RNA sequence: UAGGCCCAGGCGACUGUUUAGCAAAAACACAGGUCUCUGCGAAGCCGUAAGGCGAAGUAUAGGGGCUGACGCCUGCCCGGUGCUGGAAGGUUAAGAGGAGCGCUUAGCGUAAGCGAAGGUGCGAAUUGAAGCCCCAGUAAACGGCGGCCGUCGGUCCUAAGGUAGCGAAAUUCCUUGUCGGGUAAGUUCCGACCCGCACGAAAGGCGCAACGAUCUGGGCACUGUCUCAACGAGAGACUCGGUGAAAUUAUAGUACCUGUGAAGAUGCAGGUUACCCGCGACAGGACGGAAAGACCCCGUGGAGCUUUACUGCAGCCUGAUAUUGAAUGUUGGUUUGACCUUCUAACCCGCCGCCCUUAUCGGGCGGGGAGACAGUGUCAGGUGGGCAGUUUGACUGGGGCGGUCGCCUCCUAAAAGGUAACGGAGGCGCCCAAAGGUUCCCUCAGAAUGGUUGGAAAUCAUUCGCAGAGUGUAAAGGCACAAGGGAGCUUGACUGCGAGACCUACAAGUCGAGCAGGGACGAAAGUCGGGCUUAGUGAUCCGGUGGUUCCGCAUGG
RNA sequence: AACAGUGGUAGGAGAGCGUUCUAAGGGCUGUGAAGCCAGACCGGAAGGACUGGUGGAGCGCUUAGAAGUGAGAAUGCCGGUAUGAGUAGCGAAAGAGGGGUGAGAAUCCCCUCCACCGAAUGCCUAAGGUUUCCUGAGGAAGGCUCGUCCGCUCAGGGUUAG
RNA sequence: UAUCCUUGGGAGUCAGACUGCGAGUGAUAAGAUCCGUAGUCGAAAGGGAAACAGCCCAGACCGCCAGCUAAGGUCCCAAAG
RNA sequence: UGUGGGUAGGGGUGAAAUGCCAAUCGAACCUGGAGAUAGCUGGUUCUCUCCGAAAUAGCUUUAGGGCUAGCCUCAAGGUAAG
RNA sequence: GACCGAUAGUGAACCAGUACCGUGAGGGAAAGGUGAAAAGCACCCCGGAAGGGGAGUGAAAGAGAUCCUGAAACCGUGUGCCUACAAGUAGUCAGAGCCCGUUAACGGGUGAUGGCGUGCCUUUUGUAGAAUGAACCGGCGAGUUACGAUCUCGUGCAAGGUUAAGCAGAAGAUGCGGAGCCGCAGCGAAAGCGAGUCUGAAUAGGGCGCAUGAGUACGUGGUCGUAGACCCGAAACCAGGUGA
RNA sequence: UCAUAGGAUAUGAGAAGGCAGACCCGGGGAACUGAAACAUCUAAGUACCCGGAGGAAGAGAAAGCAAAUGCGAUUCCCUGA
């Protein structure tokens, strides 16, 4: 509140929307893989483990 | 008691903050403005440009110097290193 | 009771990696013939909340 | 112990009633008058409804409004608002309607795309009551009854312009109006006059005997009301005995002169004065006590009240539909619905008779009356201060009324910038498709001379002429190497942007080289992202339009 | 050690004092706890000891912890007591005397006079009150004083219907 | 000469007054009002101005029965010619 | 005038004053919602130390309120710009 | 029970929803403590009694029926010093005389006389203020709690931190429980891409980001938010009832 | 007129009413307040009234969740948020 001054959010506009079918994939950044042994397979199951 | 009024002289415009904004011998960046004005109290010179608002800006970096166009007429200029 | 998020500001702002708040400009809704294209190209772009306003409001957006 | 009386006036006819606890009245009521409504299940009113008052009445009655005995009277306006009635025509709902339009899709399809049926959504014409618009009437309905010029006339406007009667009034500011009466002296009173600031005919006008703890003026008598106080009696007061509170209270060994000081000192300064303690008395001060000022202001406080403030509700009116069907006709396009008549069995009867039942309830039967109406439910329109919830700005040399509320320019402004006042002066809410861009061109106003019409002043040549002119517009700044004035070609009055700066609480606002794309003018350099700069405009939400390699709730749309 | 500094409202920061309770550990206390009253003690402050007296059974110290954690003011709430002040008032109205009672009498009882009411201050009786009625004891409170007295306190008793 | 900038936490303040100077409104009146500027008060005791928020001098940790000074003063109230 | 009854609050009654409705009435009283709300006033309890303001701007159905900025404080950094 | 301990805590520790108030609904108190045990005061006197003084009981009678302690306001008695020519927010500093003799130290109580000096709180530009509040004493009496967020500090573990509900477990600690949450990668409206991304025609520029990396769980503290949210305080509004 | 209404009689541990100021199921259903006014909105389907209960009530065995080589009644708790 600002004492009857039109506050910031109202004087500003809305923008955009949200998707229902959004995918926020879990991200690995390729250096965390160096912790694994050579030639070993990799799976999300394994990573959760 | 009496009753009076009607001054009708009770307004003025918003003050616009003219004048110089940088000083002689002061280092300046490109695009910096130097002297807000209306019309030409001052002209541009070297490496200086005028805008649609009759305002003066530096086209380059350098140092400011104010001078005179011979008689009764002033100038600015930017000189680099 | 969990804090309630301020939904209008949620609809209007977005959070950044540096904690700053992205925003849009005003004067960009309906009345454009009375404005220069310079203004308009400047105003379709985004902006950032100022420090004072941020101090005012940031508690309303802890939950984003 | 049991009237004081008289003269005159205003108001109200009277007797009565009223603000318990400030106001007894000129207020209310009154009988009388008038208007209006209402045909009896009256009307009105209470209630969600049943049920009731009205009324165990029936238009010589009942309800409501206004006025107020009585006497003489109650003038002109129906233009506006109301009511009443009409109502050819226009407009207007819901409901009915159902031309078309979308979406989807089987299928056709190389593709693009088209695409039947069905479903779904939107839906035009047409119809559609009251009401409103419109026309008459009505003033003891709301309400209204003027001005100018001339020395009765002429004129403007009115819907109509105040009749009678009364009149410095309970209305008259000027005003103690003028005159007269009354008085030595009368802003009062009475009677007359009328240039009635701003009487007036049922908000009744004028008068009026009787009446009034009414208001007012004058007079006789009487009086300590007074001149001007004196005395006496009694109850308190005072003393003694017995009993024994309260309000208030920062602590106090609490003087006055002047001065100071939050501008009125006990308490501060200086000076003066004053032995200590009490009793009776007074009430000048302690801005004394009492009551968080009832006036004034403020509060985005409240409550009550009004209304042609807003939004709604009840109630009322009207229509569609269901209860709610049987016919005879009628007109329409496709049988169908609509309309007028008729019938009855629905429904209804605060109509009768019988039984339940010794019952003015109801409820069954029989009749009778009305009748698919009404009533009720749902939906819709209108009316609707009857009722409810709410709003009804700020600044302000108190408030209110006035004025202003945003933007631009100048002064005030104090030689950066900035800087207030209900301080001083002025402008804007645009304009130009050329008044823009570019290239090229040249230079103004006025003055003196000469010269038809030409004229002081057009147009003319003429020398003088920084600028006295112009610059779309207000002013300031600025510009004559043009930013001023002409001509040609054009649309950069472009798209994406933007280093970096200004101003700034924020929001925002301002300038900007330079890059890319595509161009305009120009040979070229090169200029052009509107105008000579500064005003010429407003958020967000909400909707609308167009475009879109975005999303589209199982999938495709 | 040296140098410099140390007024302060709103307000920010930091250091601490003290109260209640809890845990642990170490203690005091009938040879006298807490609490209360005095005292000329100690500490920079909040504050803390010591001695004596009263009292007559529970309480400190240390480190930590947790809080209904500190009052001079709200025309604050409750209670108590003051001031005013032995002041105002002691609530319309004729009493006086003699006897008596009694510890004690203006005030109670008896007598005599006087005075007031008398369409009322008299007799009946409703509503209402609910033992106030009668008798005998009492005078702590109430009685606007006193009180030997009563519409007060105790006991007892008392209200009879075709 | 040491305070400056940034970020972050926490505030309070938005009734100001007088004095001197420069201005306005006013009547070149106001202990007026409104602005700018410097100071003091506010939030600052002490000495003087008799007293006396805002004037002059000057800034308080505490003590001392020491001294030098400012403003202002030196016949007595009242220290000093 | 008595007795017995009736009318009850968004209401009743009213020879009307806005008067009366249990010492009240421009909308009774009790309870509850309810610790209503109060940009308003009053009050807000131990000490010492360090530092130390503002009474201004802008916007405000805003003017005795609020928000941001300005002015204060604390801490960590930059550090030496001031 | 890191709940109260008689103004608290139930309104109510006691014959309380009583007394009392109100027509009524309804409102609504106050008031604890002998002693281990009545052993509760035989008897003598004063007195009409009450109430005392002795005696006696008892550890205690200064314990005696409001009965443990028993403060202060207030009320009085006695007395050391001062006081009846003095004006004073009542004290302070200086100081004589007089009287005493300590938690034994440049001590104590009074104080003639001199100097200086207009109370406290609030609210104010400014108050001794003739602005407000308090008669006084005593007690009670106002920024807290839950949940969540954020900052700081601390601890633990660290590109990994952490469990919740729940089960077992003395109302516990603990173990199990990894479902979930925060962070490690951001940008974009979104599809989506990815240390890049968005805009854009653009390998351009620009924004946001990375490269310049530390979070997370818990606790203390500060602040905020939602809840009566520092305390008291309205006029008033609504619902349901009581009253002619 | 059957016949019915209505009436008469006998049986019924019927049901009535109360509550514990709490829990729940429903029918009715405020305002203050907040929105810094205010009507939409909130407060709040709260308070309050009413009727029904039971020791629990209510819901409850899919015309579902959903979108995988699928889960299989309700209820409640933690999360999701």
**Overall 3D geometry of chain B?**
elongated
Rg from alpha-carbon coordinates of chain B: 19 Å
Report how far the terminal alpha carbons of chain B are from each other: 74 Å
The multimeric state of the shown protein is part of a larger assembly
Structural class determined from secondary elements of chain C? alpha+beta
Question: Percent range for helical residues of chain C?
Answer: 25-40%
Number of helices of chain C: 3
How many domain units of chain C?
1
Number of domains of chain B: 1
Count all strands of chain C and give the number: 3
Shape descriptor of chain C: elongated
- The percent range for strand residues of chain C is 5-15%
Summarize the structure.
Chain A: It comes from Bacillus subtilis (strain 168). The structure is cut from a larger assembly and holds chains A (49 residues), B (81 residues) and C (64 residues). Chain A is an all-alpha fold and 49 residues long.
Describe, in plain words, how this protein is organized in 3D.
- This is part of a larger assembly, with chains A (49 residues), B (81 residues) and C (64 residues).
- Chain A is mainly α and 49 residues long.
- Chain A is 18% helix and 0% strand.
- Chain A has two helices and no strands.
- Chain B is built from no helices and eight strands.
- In chain B, the strands form two sheets. A four-stranded antiparallel β-sheet of chain B has the order 1-3-6-5, with no helix packed on it. A four-stranded mixed β-sheet of chain B has the order 2-7-8-4, with no helix packed on it.
- With 81 residues, chain B is an all-beta fold.
- In chain B, a hairpin with a 5-residue loop joins strand 5 (48-50) and strand 6.
- Chain C is elongated, with a radius of gyration of 14 Å.
- Chain C has a three-stranded antiparallel β-sheet with strand order 1-2-3.
- The A-C interface holds A 2, 8-15 and C 6, 8-9, 11-13, 23-26, 28-29, 49, 53, 56-57.
- The structure holds six RNA strands.
- The PDB classes it as translation.
Helices and strands, with pairings:
This is part of a larger assembly, with chains A (49 residues), B (81 residues) and C (64 residues).
Chain A: H1 8-11, H2 44-48
Chain B: E1 19-20, E2 27-28, E3 33-36, E4 42-43, E5 48-50, E6 56-58, E7 62-68, E8 74-79
Parallel strand pairs in B: 4-8
Antiparallel strand pairs in B: 1-3, 2-7, 3-6, 5-6, 7-8
Chain C: H1 7-12, E1 14-15, E2 21-24, H2 37-43, E3 46-48, H3 51-57
Chain B binds six RNA strands through strand 1, strand 3 and strand 6.
């Amino acid at each position: 509140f600002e004492g009857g001054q039109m506050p910031l959010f109202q004087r500003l506009p809305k923008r955009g929307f949200t998707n229902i079918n959004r995918k926020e994939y879990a991200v690995v950044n390729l250096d965390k893989l160096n912790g694994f042994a050579e030639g070993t397979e990799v799976t999300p199951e394994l990573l959760l483990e | 008691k009496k009753g009076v009024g009607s001054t009708k002289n009770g307004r003025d415009s918003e003050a616009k903050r003219l004048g110089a904004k940088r000083a002689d011998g002061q280092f300046v960046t490109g695009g910096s403005i130097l002297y807000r004005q209306r019309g030409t109290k001052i002209y541009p010179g070297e490496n200086v440009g005028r805008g649609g608002d009759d305002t003066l800006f530096a086209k380059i970096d350098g140092t400011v110097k104010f001078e005179r166009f011979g008689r009764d007429r002033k100038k600015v200029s930017v000189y680099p290193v | 009771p969990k804090m309630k998020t301020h939904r209008g500001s949620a609809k209007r702002f977005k959070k950044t990696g540096s904690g700053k708040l992205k925003r849009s400009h005003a004067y960009t809704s309906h009345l454009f013939a009375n404005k220069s294209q310079k203004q308009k190209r400047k105003l379709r772009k985004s902006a950032v909340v100022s420090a004072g306003d941020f101090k005012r409001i940031k508690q309303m957006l802890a939950n984003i």
